[PDB]
């Protein structure tokens, strides 16, 4: 019988952020309301003077310390100070790691206490491009810079989604990641993602984690991009077509597995798999996306290294497709986010979709048919791993969205 | 370096003893055992072993748990996996699944059974599996948990229905990712269900978290979520004023090296009232301890700080340590080299003390008469500290301490003139 808070505000974007500072803004009660009471201000003139003095003598550690002591809930650093700390120190390629440590703590404190908005952001896409693409610069602070960027984007998206009931014209994502307006940026981030995945290091360790984290961050940016506009469907289609060719030419398999596994936007993975499957099938299919379509691909698909590995790969692709299909059906991702909020608050139920009218007999017959086809084209006994994978697909289909 | 700028740290984790309970080759949700009637459970118990991880990562449980509470052992095994899995992406995905299922259930779980949150037994289990000793988890004999190590080990092992394989460490290097997910989940549960823990439990959690932070190989990894969880826990306690001094003494008692104590003073958050209270009280306790002052139930703070400053005269402490070492040393003869070494030690100690004075002095409420105290305070720094400091170009540590005193003087002067 405890007075739970208004948990509804947490359902809007359940996907993982980098940090959970949002827990400090849940309470819509006396504590937070009275804390916000005072009107904010900038760093006092004299304090500003001393901190700039600290800047002058090229003693970055003193600057970070003094800023840490001065930043408080009733004051914020002027934008110039934020730009200085980020560009001058964080991405400086000379100092030691501890300086980057303190810088990260400083930025995190600023972001935790003051929610950055569009009119106050520091970095620009040009700087991101410089740090990422312009190789020949191995900046130790690159990972932290990317983490800060993604955290800023996520915070801004959440705040704008909460505040604005009929628009999103004042969000960082809107003006730095909208596919309609800056599609070249989307292309560049996809290129960076495929580059990072392709970066060797796996064959038959510390930097592997770096690539993994940056890849997760890029996937987060893609996921937010897929929602920034009003209609997820068109943006997802655009993104899927731009990434189809890039995913096509990935040399090895494990890279493709990492690419698909890390996928965050469920609709994006669904579209990518659907497009590749259709491109890999001789006879096109006009049936919309549904379980019937899953069986359609299962039957009429082919291979686009002994072939059993390829068939294994297709099995995994179909399981991914079924998982993402279930997720989209249950989450109602098709609608916009702004009205999806009202949908989830009202807790309206989904509805059956055309092409989902199948029975257990159908799936059993289809699975037996595929088993026969695989034996015919390869023989028996199948590889034990392949056996396990087909068995797993059998159970997943038997799920059959049994209603 | 005569004065290193960061706490040295210490070896808390031991790799060769990391993972004595369970690993990823031992946890399966099949062994939990439930009446299989829904397609969810039937599929799970008919599913293989790797299909288990596949189902977890791709949100199959989240898909299958939109209107039904997830059984508690399922969440417990998910927590275990998040804690023990080596790969980073799988661990992050498992944590995401845990957050999603917990939030959804809570939004639909109005039943008296509150959302599952790892009891101290669970967190102790995971951390000990990581390679933290019981005393390391709880190093204050005065405050100890409600159980013992053997109970935890036997219960967790028997629940996990093994010398067969030569025990390799589950992690040959700091499991940063797993620790981060564990603390993130802890913060989530603390923030969603505040009254889920008891005051004593909260205190034990604070003690173990602070002790863990002192890890040697964790110096380079920013512990922001540590601060977030600290904020939540400090906010959770119900008898605050009464509980503050006990906690302060507890943190004081964790270790001996003063720079580590300075670290823990710095690490606590300082943008919430209770955080500031903790900071100032902990600083008072530390300054009382280090100066060899008898713990006689420590405006009067003005005279107490003046007394301290008198005691922190570098020459005075130098001679005090000279006396102590001469008594300890069977001969009692100190060479110029060892004299200079003790000089470094005394300068280090004074550096730490001036830092603590800087932290304690900060305050937001002041009466007019407080001016005089500050006027005296700076004077003492100028008189009881600055004058005895003689600049020597070849000796940089003197310059460091002098500049530190200069910064303190500047801040105090600015505060004074603010009126």
Author numbering:
A (entry chain A): 425 to 628, 654 to 753, 760 to 858
B (entry chain B): 733 to 893, 897 to 1033, 1038 to 1158
The authors write:
The human SMC5/6 complex is a conserved guardian of genome stability and an emerging component of antiviral responses. Here, we identify a novel SMC5/6 subunit called SIMC1 that contains SUMO interacting motifs (SIMs) and an Nse5-like domain. SIMC1’s Nse5-like domain binds to the putative Nse6 orthologue SLF2 to form an anti-parallel helical dimer resembling the yeast Nse5/6 structure. Thus, two Nse5/6-like complexes with distinct recruitment domains control human SMC5/6 localization.
